[PDB]
Every structure is written in C-alpha cells, then in structure tokens.
Design an enzyme around this catalytic site. Structure first.
Site, mmCIF file in Angstrom:
data_model
loop_
_atom_site.group_PDB
_atom_site.id
_atom_site.type_symbol
_atom_site.label_atom_id
_atom_site.label_comp_id
_atom_site.label_asym_id
_atom_site.label_seq_id
_atom_site.Cartn_x
_atom_site.Cartn_y
_atom_site.Cartn_z
ATOM 1 N N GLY A 1 0.785 -1.232 0.000
ATOM 2 C CA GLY A 1 0.000 0.000 0.000
ATOM 3 C C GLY A 1 0.816 1.280 0.000
ATOM 4 O O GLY A 1 0.578 2.158 -0.826
ATOM 5 N N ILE A 2 1.776 1.387 0.921
ATOM 6 C CA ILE A 2 2.677 2.558 1.001
ATOM 7 C C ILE A 2 3.276 2.928 -0.348
ATOM 8 O O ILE A 2 3.738 4.048 -0.549
ATOM 9 C CB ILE A 2 3.848 2.340 1.990
ATOM 10 N N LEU B 1 -14.739 -1.580 -7.012
ATOM 11 C CA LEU B 1 -15.103 -1.566 -8.439
ATOM 12 C C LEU B 1 -14.642 -2.792 -9.245
ATOM 13 O O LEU B 1 -13.640 -2.751 -9.969
ATOM 14 C CB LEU B 1 -14.675 -0.246 -9.102
ATOM 15 N N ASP C 1 -6.520 14.658 -14.251
ATOM 16 C CA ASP C 1 -5.918 13.374 -14.668
ATOM 17 C C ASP C 1 -6.975 12.371 -15.130
ATOM 18 O O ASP C 1 -6.948 11.208 -14.763
ATOM 19 C CB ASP C 1 -5.073 12.784 -13.553
HETATM 20 C C1 MK3 Z 1 -10.598 -7.945 -10.036
HETATM 21 N N1 MK3 Z 1 -10.139 -8.225 -8.690
HETATM 22 C C2 MK3 Z 1 -10.780 -7.722 -7.573
HETATM 23 O O1 MK3 Z 1 -11.432 -8.416 -6.805
HETATM 24 C C3 MK3 Z 1 -10.580 -6.301 -7.402
HETATM 25 C C4 MK3 Z 1 -9.436 -5.640 -7.007
HETATM 26 C C5 MK3 Z 1 -9.576 -4.225 -6.939
HETATM 27 C C6 MK3 Z 1 -8.624 -3.293 -6.583
HETATM 28 C C7 MK3 Z 1 -9.035 -1.982 -6.606
HETATM 29 C C8 MK3 Z 1 -10.292 -1.531 -6.947
HETATM 30 C C9 MK3 Z 1 -10.475 -0.091 -6.904
HETATM 31 C C10 MK3 Z 1 -9.446 0.675 -7.416
HETATM 32 C C11 MK3 Z 1 -9.417 2.053 -7.417
HETATM 33 N N2 MK3 Z 1 -8.284 2.686 -7.984
HETATM 34 C C12 MK3 Z 1 -7.774 3.932 -7.568
HETATM 35 C C13 MK3 Z 1 -6.456 4.206 -7.851
HETATM 36 C C14 MK3 Z 1 -5.976 5.424 -7.433
HETATM 37 N N3 MK3 Z 1 -6.708 6.328 -6.781
HETATM 38 C C15 MK3 Z 1 -7.975 5.983 -6.551
HETATM 39 N N4 MK3 Z 1 -8.786 6.891 -5.879
HETATM 40 N N5 MK3 Z 1 -8.530 4.826 -6.920
HETATM 41 C C16 MK3 Z 1 -10.501 2.717 -6.880
HETATM 42 C C17 MK3 Z 1 -11.558 1.994 -6.369
HETATM 43 C C18 MK3 Z 1 -11.541 0.613 -6.374
HETATM 44 O O2 MK3 Z 1 -12.628 -0.027 -5.834
HETATM 45 C C19 MK3 Z 1 -11.245 -2.459 -7.304
HETATM 46 C C20 MK3 Z 1 -10.857 -3.791 -7.290
HETATM 47 S S1 MK3 Z 1 -11.839 -5.154 -7.689
#
Ligand code: MK3
Length: 279
Positions: free
Chosen positions: A27-28, A95, A134
């Site tokens: 994460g960091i 997401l 962005d």
């Molecule tokens: C398909 N395998 C999974 O099970 C999933 C792994 C992830 C990992 C991240 C996300 C997800 C990612 C972001 N990305 C970022 C990146 C940078 N900054 C921000 N504000 N958001 C924002 C909201 C999210 O839910 C959704 C999923 S589904």
C-alpha cells in the site's frame, strides 16, 4: 440537501477491516487493495497515503466529490500510525468491473452513453469548482462485471480546487471520445503533434461517423484552451444530451482495441504524460 461532513477515524483500521501486513506493505507504494469489512463482510478498496498537505488535499476533494453518482465513493478515512509514520488510509467502494476500455475489449449509442457518464462526473466536479486534471483510461472504472454497471471516475491525486484547469478535463473528454469511436487515440515527435493539434479521422473507422460528432471532438481537442467547449456546453450537445436518439451504428472500436492491444500500454503512457505536461 444537508450531508454529513468528513470524519477521520483514529482507531486502528484493522479493527474494522481485514487487512494484513503484506497487503499493507504493498500500500505505502501507491497500489490500491482488496480489503473486507468485518461487521458486514462486504468488499472495499484501500488506498494508502503518507500524511502530508498533498494527501490531505486529495482526501478532502475526493470526499467532497463522493456524492456524485459517477465518482468512486469514499466510505471511510483513517488516520493511523504505520511503522512510526503518519498515514491516511482511504476506504472506497469496490469496483469489480475493471477499466472502461478493458470492457469494450470483449455501437455509437453505447459510446455516447459512456461519455454522458464521464460527463456527469466532470459537471459535478466543475460545479463545485474542482478540476480533476488526470482523467484518463485507468481512472474510469466500472462498478461490476454486469452489462448495466455504472462507470465511475476515480483517483484525485492531482485534483485541484479552483479556467485552464477545467479545460484540461475537457481535453481528456475529447481524447476518450476519439478512442471510444474507433479504438485508437488521435495524433497517430508526439509532443509536437499534440502542440500542433495534428490528428485526423481516418477511413475506414470514421467513414460512417456523423460530422456533428467529429465537430464535437474537434471542439474538445482545441489546442487553445480558451477555445474548448465547457462541460455545460458538452452536456447540452445533442449527441450527449439525447443519448437515445443516437443511431445504433456499429463501431470498429472493439476489434481494433483487440488487434492493436500491446500498443495499449504505450497509449496509457503517452496520455499520462500529455496530462502531466498540461498541468
Ligand atoms: C478484479 N479483482 C478484484 O477483486 C478487485 C481488485 C480491486 C482493486 C481496486 C479496486 C479499486 C481501485 C481504485 N483505484 C484507484 C487508484 C488510485 N486512486 C484511486 N482513488 N482509486 C478505486 C476503487 C476501487 O474499488 C477495485 C478492485 S476489484
């Protein structure tokens, strides 16, 4: 009308969510991660920042924008101490659906319904004087893997509370549109061609595309920022406004985005630095 203000929790985030040292250590270094709410079991996303004015800015702006149906919701924000270092742990809606263009990689009206959505995210931001700066392929995510998922704008690392900035969001809209309608970006040095506004609408991909639509891309991609249309004018354009009077005409997008994959990493890269250059 009255929504609650932002409350930064100070308890150890691990009281509320399953998170491990391995999924913390990654994460960091910017990456966002899969975490689980203990009480409900639901899936959420974690993003970790080092506390500092920039991080506080991001959190603040993002919280303000979460309200929008088309922007990833912040669900909680924690202020914790990670390895003797102050951190902001941001908890977000999950997401599952992946990135906008990854889906398509599997119709003019479909293209329009998408842009109207990204359109709302920008209108909301601009209404409350925030510019995202962005807006690009990897910050557009689909809530789930269903055909009817909601597309959402994410990542406020460069958002800025205010115009030149806003017109930067409009330029992205033009670029995302271009690609949506054909499957490759415009401007096909790179820096020079962007400066010069050197793009075209090649046949075959563009032959049966409305001059009205092209004119629209033409307004968004204007090289002179004060020349681009604003979000309000975008959102009132017939093509966007009545997304259900737009011809179901097929697009080469999905095939092209499939053959011409491998270049995709390079266009994500170019667009990231184009954006970096206009900031
Ligand atoms: C398909 N395998 C999974 O099970 C999933 C792994 C992830 C990992 C991240 C996300 C997800 C990612 C972001 N990305 C970022 C990146 C940078 N900054 C921000 N504000 N958001 C924002 C909201 C999210 O839910 C959704 C999923 S589904």
């Amino acid at each position: 009308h009255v929504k609650s203000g932002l409350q930064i929790k100070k308890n150890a985030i691990i009281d509320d969510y399953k998170v491990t040292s391995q999924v913390l250590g990654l994460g960091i270094n910017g990456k966002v991660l899969q975490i689980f709410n203990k009480r409900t079991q639901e899936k959420f996303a974690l993003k970790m920042l080092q506390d500092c004015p920039k991080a506080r800015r991001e959190v603040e702006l993002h919280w303000r924008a979460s309200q929008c149906p088309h922007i990833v919701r912040i669900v909680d924000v924690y202020e914790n101490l990670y390895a003797g270092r102050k951190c902001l742990l941001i908890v977000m809606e999950c997401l599952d659906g992946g990135e906008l263009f990854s889906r398509i990689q599997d119709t003019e009206r479909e293209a329009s319904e998408i842009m109207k959505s990204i359109g709302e995210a920008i209108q909301y931001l601009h209404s409350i004087n925030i510019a995202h700066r962005d807006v690009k392929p990897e910050n557009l995510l689909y809530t789930s893997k269903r055909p009817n998922a909601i597309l959402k704008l994410t990542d406020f690392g460069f958002a800025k509370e205010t115009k030149y900035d806003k017109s930067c969001d409009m330029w992205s809209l033009g670029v995302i549109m271009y690609i949506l309608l054909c499957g490759y970006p415009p401007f096909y040095g790179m820096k020079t061609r962007i400066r010069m506004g050197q793009y075209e609408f090649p046949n075959p991909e563009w032959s049966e595309v409305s001059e009205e639509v092209k004119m629209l891309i033409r307004n968004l991609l204007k090289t002179e920022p004060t020349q681009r249309m604003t979000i309000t004018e975008f959102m009132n354009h017939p093509w966007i406004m009545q997304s259900t009077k737009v011809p179901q005409t097929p697009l080469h997008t999905s095939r092209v985005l499939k053959e011409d994959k491998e270049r995709w990493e390079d266009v994500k890269e170019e667009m990231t630095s184009a954006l970096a250059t206009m900031r």
